[PDB]
Amino acid sequence: TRAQLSIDLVNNVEQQEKINSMRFIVFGSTPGGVRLDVNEHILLSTPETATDIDAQLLEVTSSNDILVVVIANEPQSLTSQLDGIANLLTLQEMIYDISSILNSDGQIISATGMPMTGVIRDISIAPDETKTVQMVIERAVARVDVFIEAIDGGAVTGYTAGSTSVTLHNFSHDSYFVMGNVGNGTRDNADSSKNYGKVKEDVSESNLLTHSWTAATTETWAYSSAPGAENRKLLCSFYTAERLFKSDYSDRLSISMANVLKGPSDVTGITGKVIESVTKVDGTGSPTAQPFTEIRRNNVYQVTARVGKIGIQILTISVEDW
Numbered sequence: 135t136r137a138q139l140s141i142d143l144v145n146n147v148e149q150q151e152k153i154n155s156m157r158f159i160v161f162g163s164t165p166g167g168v169r170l171d172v173n174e175h176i177l178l179s180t181p182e183t184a185t186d187i188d189a190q191l192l193e194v195t196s197s198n199d200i201l202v203v204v205i206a207n208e209p210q211s212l213t214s215q216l217d218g219i220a221n222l223l224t225l226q227e228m229i230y231d232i233s234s235i236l237n238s239d240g241q242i243i244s245a246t247g248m249p250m251t252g253v254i255r256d257i258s259i260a261p262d263e264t265k266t267v268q269m270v271i272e273r274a275v276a277r278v279d280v281f282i283e284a285i286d287g288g289a290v291t292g293y294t295a296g297s298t299s300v301t302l303h304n305f306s307h308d309s310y311f312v313m314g315n316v317g318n319g320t321r322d323n324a325d326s327s328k329n330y331g332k333v334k335e336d337v338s339e340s341n342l343l344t345h346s347w348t349a350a351t352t353e354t355w356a357y358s359s360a361p362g363a364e365n366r367k368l369l370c371s372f373y374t375a376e377r378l379f380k381s382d383y384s385d386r387l388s389i390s391m392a393n394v395l396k397g398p399s400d401v402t403g404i405t406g407k408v409i410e411s412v413t414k415v416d417g418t419g420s421p422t423a424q425p426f427t428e429i430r431r432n433n434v435y436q437v438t439a440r441v442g443k444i445g446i447q448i449l450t451i452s453v454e455d456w
Contacts (some may be wrong), residue, residue, distance in 0.1 A: 137196045137259040140266040141204065142185040143252075146354055149456055151248040151273065152181040152368055157192060157205040159414075161222050162197035170220055171195050175213070176291060179248070189266060200257035201330070203312055204271050207247030209234045212311060225312055226332055232307035240345070240372065249274040253314035253330040267323055270317035272432035274309065277456065278372040278387070279303060279436040283396060284357040284365045292354030292395040293440040299348040302372045303388035303406065308341045309334060309375035313431055333428070334377035337385055345372065354395060366438060374433035386426060388412060394446060402445045408438065414452040426450070 141158060156181035160172035171194050184206075194200065203225065208216060211234050219225050224297025230249075237243050252271035259265050274350045280300045284291050292298075313331035347370040357365055379386050387409040412435065413423045429435070433452055440447040 135196065137194050137261060138258070138264045139192045139194045139200070139202070140189040140264065141192060141202060142189040142266055142268045143187055143204065144268050145184050145270070148184070149248065150183045150185065151207070152183060153187060153206045154178055154181045154245075154247045155205075155249075156187075156190070157203075157208055157216060158192055159203040159205070159216075159219060159225065160192060160194050161201040161203075162195055163199040164195065164197065164435055168222065170222075171197075171200070173217070173219060175217065184271060188433045193261065194251045194252065196259050196261045196263070197365075198258050199255075200259065201253065201255050202257065202267065202269070203330075204252045204269065205312070206250040206252075207273055208249055209246060224309070226330065228311045230274075230309060230311045232309060232373055233274075236273075236373060240347070241406055242373075249311070251312050252318055253320040254318040255314075255320050255328060255330065265303060267455075270315050272313070272315055272359050273456070274311060274313070275376050276429050276430060276431055277434040278305065278374055279434055279437040280371070280389070281366050281436060282369050283367075283438050283440050284355050285440050286357050286359075286441065288440070288442045289397040290354060290356045290395070293349040293352065294393060294395065295349055295352045297348075297393035297401075298395070299346055299392045300370050301344065301346045301390045303344045303390070304342045304375035304385050305345070305372055306334070306337050306341050306343060306377060307373070307375055307385060308337065308391060308454055309377070309431075313376070320322055325373070334375060336380055337377055342385055347372075369439075374429055376429055378428050379426070383410070383427075387429075387435075389448060391439060391446065394439060394441065396441055396445070402441070404439070404446055404448060407448050409435075409448075409450050412450045416452070
């Protein structure tokens, strides 16, 4: 009748997020049909990372086909919905506002934490059998980093507390909450039937955000040949939802900057440059720029403002390290 399923979360190391809340939603095929088997919400007194978390034993109903959804650091706004979930596809329809997990300064509220999700499919367990299922969970947000970079042959650059600013256009905080992983075979799979999770499309101008982020500190720096040098310095970070850009690419991310220091006695900026291409630098032999068609969850989009003699050149890369 019953079986024991041990879920062991994996990262495969030091920058992995602390977990305050855990939720295990198990679905299984019964003779009568698909039914919710387990919905368990565990609250951790000592927040720990996915590697520090011991395998979680779940008492399940033996089935030839079981689907497990794991949710870490769920926003308080979805707990009422999650506690009352009954259907798997109604879960896939659940949307959340990223603005919930963010404070006044635009950074994650440490107390609720970074929401993470993962889905694993096609689990077979027989009565009284014990199985360990190893799975990955990914962050339910994307990050847009903005850097100022001093380059060889360029001018002395920097930012000033009062006037240097950066404005990001067409970002959104409207996202589908649960999303499967490539690592668990529940994303970018051959047949869409083995995939889990929806991604936002044709976002309204109402849902597209714009936010200015004036510098707090002041520092100037010139290009250095030395190894200890930090020529590429971070100015600001923005959080955006995972979504597909429209066909016309009218909602593509845009950036503008003001009073970026250029030379000893001048400044320079950007006025609405669209981020039309991104270079995925995930492997040393992967330096190819591609069209920016999708904002993808658990990826950091790093926009760099390269300061030359005459002005700024914006270059954007895709990284998976937070």
